[PDB]
Design a binder for these strands. Structure first.
Lengths: 97, 209
RNA sequence: UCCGGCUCUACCUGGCUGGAGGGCAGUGAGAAAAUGUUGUGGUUAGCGGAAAUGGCUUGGGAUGGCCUGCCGUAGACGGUGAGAGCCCGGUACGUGAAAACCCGACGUCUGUCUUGAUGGUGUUCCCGAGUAGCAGCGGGCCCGUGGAAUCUGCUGUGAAUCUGCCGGGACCACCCGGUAAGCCUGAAUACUUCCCAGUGACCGAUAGCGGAUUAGUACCGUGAGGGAAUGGUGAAAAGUACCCCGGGAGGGGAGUGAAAGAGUACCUGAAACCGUGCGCUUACAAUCCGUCAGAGCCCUCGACGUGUCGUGGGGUGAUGGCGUGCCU
RNA sequence: GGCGUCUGGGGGGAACGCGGGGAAGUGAAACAUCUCAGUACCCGUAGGAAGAGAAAACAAAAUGUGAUUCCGUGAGUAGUGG
């Protein structure tokens, strides 16, 4: 969904706006991602008990992938006619992400 | 006869047009315009709305119980209008709303609507909206802002003119209409009328003959 | 155009048929079955697609307010924590077919004309038979048997082949039109089980399909058949860890949450109906249950002292007068 | 008639077509003629559409139209009807 697992993203909107993180999982069915260090919840875990702190998924519309320079960037696509590939290109600088 | 100053995108006046006194100087008739613009709206409204009467609801073909002896109200079906789930007694049916308005009434409405614009100096004529064979709405927006500062405007553009039409499409308040398809409702809805020189001549030549 | 064999046979004159140039048509009503080549022609998957992490303030959250930019062949519509052209899916605008199917097109192929046509003269043969016509009983035409033509069914009777036959609203004569009893024929026209893209001065959970949820399901009937009811926590489940009472249910602390007057019996939460607390009133009294006077007590707003009046407001009402529900 | 062998049928489908059979409640302020109606229903059949179609046709003295089908008018008129 233009944002993959293992990318580094910048949060756009929400209580954690401006924070940076790395994507852990993606849920392409519901357009949500889980990003390291953002949207922390306080869960009451009963086993023995605990009050744990995990990350709830962020809707992907609220994150922007950081450019290799370090700026938030909408991703574009170039068509490699050699192998027929479709490589994700940063809009700001034109480099591969 | 009203002399309309023709403008160009470069800002240079080209010539002038002479609006006929027949077409562009009729005394506006409010009662006649109102009937016409209501007629077009009624033709726009599509009558797609229906409900099933007592006859068209699924089932309810049997007298639910005896006429006498039960001790309840006499009932003839399980779908009568008073029931829950019963038929709709006087409901909407799909109908057409277009009405026949005489040709002389409809045409005279347009002349009155246009004559009103001419009096208050709202009719503009332009040779072409933008440089040819390349749509660009930034140029068209700059031009239209130069001509008229009002929020809404109507652009009469010849059918074959595509760079002009496809340029001013995206603008918020701008409506574009062919000189043959000119109608009352569109004209009254606009603050100005931005004719095209080829369109303005075509409209004038159509009626004046 | 040429050639051959036939027109009993061979020989010189007129026809018939086959085989080679040339046209002319073809999946058609005018005959039929195929076969290749091609067409950025179409359908059946998709891909690209411009522009703000803008500043300040309210906020849990900005998509709200104010102020700056930017795209626009894109300011259609949805989504994202509240009204988003510049965050996402997309739109404008372009691009995409290995294979299958469908439309064309060019050929193999099929058939036909050329052993053939053009225009002239006077007579015999042919032009759809148990048919047409007539009669009896019906049908149907504006026409209900009427003066009742044309069309048609069943039972009888039953003709002509062109100066023939049938129609021109009984019929007769003249004139006019046509040539029955043989057969094919596309377009204009009606529809939507289904598939694709849309629209609504249409409904929004007693509405709209009977069916937003187990739906022709549950259930009723031996059977044909009849045939329901039930949507909404929150932005996210973060769905209350832990302690206390209790067998449990349920609850009280403590937490998540912006809110628990959102706790999976969950948006908003009315009325009937059911309680709890407080103020006034009621156990000598005949009451369509009100209304008009109206003592007392309680609350309130002012001015003036301890409480006492007022162009005051409310709640109760002891007591007197009047008073026979609403609709048909 | 019996064999052997090749090709076909049979059943389903919402609407539209064509050819047959064909009511009653109802209106007539009763009712039988008539209407409802060739409607409801039933039967046999295809097609992507079907049916009709190339004058034994109209017309009215005009040296006129020129296969069929389907819309608008003619017209609620000419007529028909206990």
């Amino acid at each position: 969904m233009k944002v993959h697992k293992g990318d580094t993203v910048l949060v756009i909107s929400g209580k954690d706006k401006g924070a940076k993180g790395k994507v852990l999982v993606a849920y392409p069915d519901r357009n949500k991602v889980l990003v390291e260090g953002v949207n922390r919840i306080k869960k009451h875990t009963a086993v023995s008990g605990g009050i744990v702190t995990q990350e709830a998924p962020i809707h992907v519309s609220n994150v922007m992938v950081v450019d290799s320079d370090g700026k938030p960037t909408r991703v574009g696509y170039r068509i490699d006619d050699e192998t027929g590939k479709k490589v994700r290109i940063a809009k700001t600088n034109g480099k591969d992400i | 006869t009203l002399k309309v100053d023709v403008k160009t995108p470069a800002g240079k006046t080209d010539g002038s047009v002479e609006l006929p006194a027949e077409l562009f100087d009729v005394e506006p008739n409010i009662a006649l315009m109102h009937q016409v613009v209501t007629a077009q709206l009624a033709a726009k409204r599509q009558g797609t709305h229906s409900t099933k009467t007592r006859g068209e609801v699924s089932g309810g073909g049997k007298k639910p119980y005896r006429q006498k002896g039960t001790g309840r109200a006499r009932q003839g079906s399980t779908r009568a209008p008073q029931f829950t789930g019963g038929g709709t007694v006087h409901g909407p049916k799909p109908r057409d709303y277009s009405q026949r308005t005489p040709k002389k009434m409809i045409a005279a409405a347009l002349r009155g609507a246009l004559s009103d614009r001419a009096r208050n100096d709202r009719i503009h004529a332009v040779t072409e909206l933008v440089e040819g064979q390349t749509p660009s709405t930034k140029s068209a927006k700059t031009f239209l802002g130069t001509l008229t500062e009002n929020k809404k405007v109507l652009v009469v553009i010849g059918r074959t003119d595509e760079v002009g039409a496809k340029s001013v499409r995206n603008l918020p308040g701008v409506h574009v209409i062919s000189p043959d398809q000119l109608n009352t409702y569109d004209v009254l809805n606009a603050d100005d009328v931005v004719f095209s020189v080829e369109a303005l001549n075509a409209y004038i030549s159509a009626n004046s003959k």
